[PDB]
Structures are given as structure tokens and as C-alpha cells.
Ligand binder design. Structure first.
Ligand code: PFQ
Length: 272
């Protein structure tokens, strides 16, 4: 009945990527703010159709909400939850990181999102601080399901063989093996995000034997740059996450049992 409720004003650009651009859209009547992902199909018709498909399945507090999609000619418009706090990346101070209580709360919320995704049989495949967005209250939301896929369907696990993600966040098995389980890969990337949050630096360019920094970690040289700035409790968790063998790697149910994970560190809202 409301005459102008369907109208949305494109106020400002939020960022320009490879697929296209993301714009801030504000409703004409309600003044509700949403983000619109603009992707040129004529300048990928395959990777975007799967992104919409996965987004349709998801409904969680730590996952960027999907409102709908419009197919105006060639351009695909993806209406998503606006996260005003920006990326977790910009909350990480270079070579220092962030306060340990902040990192723990972000990691808690990250695990909550990943648990949900894995429970519905989907893997993100590109977990990194650039893809972890913050809302008005600093709540973490997992974003960008353009590289995501189904790893469990009708209670049968499908092994992955496609190499994707981001090299510094990638698990060693996807560079080493033809086939690999989906879940430990996401777990590994979550560990690299934790390292970044607590040290303000990435441990290695890639998890390979040719990489000196990765070889030092396997040699347990925790006296070196990233690990020496972390602290024993969270480092002990990192020792369990960043395990080369994905079969010996800690699972999320066991991460929730970890000492540092359950260590009281963070207070609530400021007098509220
Ligand atoms: O879901 C992926 C689309 N991206 C977004 N989705 C949903 N909400 C968002 O808020 C942002 C954003 C918010 C505040 C400042 C800057 C960016 C962005 C944003 C857009 C482009 C590149 C990186 C981040 C964003």
C-alpha cells in the first residue's frame, strides 16, 4: 500500500572489487540501510548463481543476511545486510594486532558462524579478516559466499579437489593432496585469522615446506616474530589448530573445550 516503499537510493560506494562494486542503499521511506552487490555477468554466469543459491539457505546472526536478488538485464543485484563497522581487517593494528579480549569475542562469534555453516553442509573456503564484517554493535558477520560450496548433502560427505581461497589462509593439504575434507580447511583459516588478530601479522605467504616461516613453526620455533607476541594460552590453541595433518587437526567441538576459548577476559557493553 505504501507508494514509495520499494525505492532505494544509492548513497555512496562501499568498495570496488573484481566482480564489480558494493554500494550503500538507503530506503526512500523507512531510511533503512542495506548493501547492494553489483556483479557484471557479461564482464561470470556460473560463480554468481551458486552464490545466490547458497545465500538463500543461510539464516544466522553471525552470517551476513540475504534479503533478495534482482536481475535487471545483465547486471545482478545482491541485496545484503549492511555492516557499518566495516571489515575486521581494519580493526587489526599492523604488527601489534588487537586487545586479547576483543580477539576472543571475535573468535567466539566466528566459531558460531562456522559451526552453523558446517552444520548445514556448506564450507566458506575463503575465511579471512577482509571477509569478516562488523555491524553497528561490533558483531562479527561472515560475508562473501562466492567461493563457498556444498560439502555435505543427504548426510553424505563430498571430498573437495578444487584449489581455492587465499594463499596465506590456505591449509597445507589443499596444496599437497588431490582430495581433502572441507571442515579442517575452514578450521585452519580460522587459526590464521586468530594469529592475525593477536600478532598483527601473517605467519607465512603459504603453508609449504619451501616456506622458511612455515618450516620454523613445524620445528616449534615459537620464539620467532608472530608466536612470541601471542601468549601461552591462545598459542596453545594455535598449536592445535595449525597442525599439518588435517586428520590430527583439532575440530570445532574440541576448540569449544579449549582453555583460552573458555577463559574469562571480556566485559560487556559500556555500563549497559
Ligand atoms: O557481503 C560482501 C559485500 N560487502 C559488504 N556487505 C555488507 N555490508 C557491507 O558493509 C561494507 C562496508 C561498510 C562500512 C565501510 C566500508 C564497507 C561492505 C563492504 C563493501 C565493499 C568492500 C568491502 C566491504 C559490505
Amino acid at each position: 500500500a505504501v507508494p514509495f516503499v520499494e525505492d532505494w537510493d544509492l548513497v555512496q560506494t562501499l568498495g570496488e572489487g573484481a566482480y564489480g562494486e558494493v554500494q550503500l542503499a538507503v530506503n526512500r521511506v523507512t531510511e533503512e540501510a542495506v548493501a547492494v552487490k553489483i556483479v557484471d555477468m557479461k564482464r561470470c554466469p556460473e560463480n554468481i548463481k551458486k552464490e545466490i543459491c547458497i545465500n538463500k539457505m543461510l539464516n544466522h546472526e553471525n552470517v551476513v543476511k540475504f534479503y533478495g536478488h534482482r536481475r535487471e538485464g545483465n547486471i545482478q543485484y545482491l541485496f545484503l545486510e549492511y555492516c557499518s563497522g566495516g571489515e575486521l581487517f581494519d580493526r587489526i593494528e599492523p604488527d601489534i594486532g588487537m586487545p586479547e579480549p576483543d580477539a576472543q569475542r571475535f573468535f567466539h562469534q566466528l566459531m558460531a558462524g562456522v559451526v552453523y555453516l558446517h552444520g548445514i553442509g556448506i564450507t566458506h573456503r575463503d575465511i579471512k579478516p577482509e571477509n569478516l564484517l562488523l555491524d553497528e554493535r561490533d558483531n562479527l558477520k561472515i560475508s562473501d559466499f562466492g567461493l563457498a560450496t556444498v560439502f555435505r548433502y543427504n548426510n553424505r560427505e563430498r571430498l573437495l579437489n578444487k584449489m581455492c581461497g587465499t594463499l596465506p589462509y590456505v591449509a597445507p593439504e589443499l596444496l599437497k593432496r588431490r582430495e581433502f575434507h572441507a571442515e579442517p580447511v575452514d578450521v585452519w583459516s580460522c587459526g590464521i585469522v586468530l594469529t592475525a588478530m593477536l600478532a598483527g601479522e601473517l605467519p607465512w605467504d603459504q603453508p609449504s615446506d619451501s616456506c622458511q616461516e612455515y618450516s620454523d613453526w613445524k620445528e616449534k620455533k615459537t620464539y620467532l616474530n608472530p608466536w612470541k607476541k601471542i601468549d601461552s594460552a591462545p598459542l596453545a590453541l594455535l598449536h592445535k589448530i595449525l597442525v599439518e595433518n588435517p586428520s590430527a587437526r583439532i575440530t570445532i567441538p574440541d576448540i569449544k573445550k579449549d582453555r583460552w576459548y573458555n577463559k574469562p577476559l571480556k566485559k560487556g557493553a559500556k555500563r549497559p
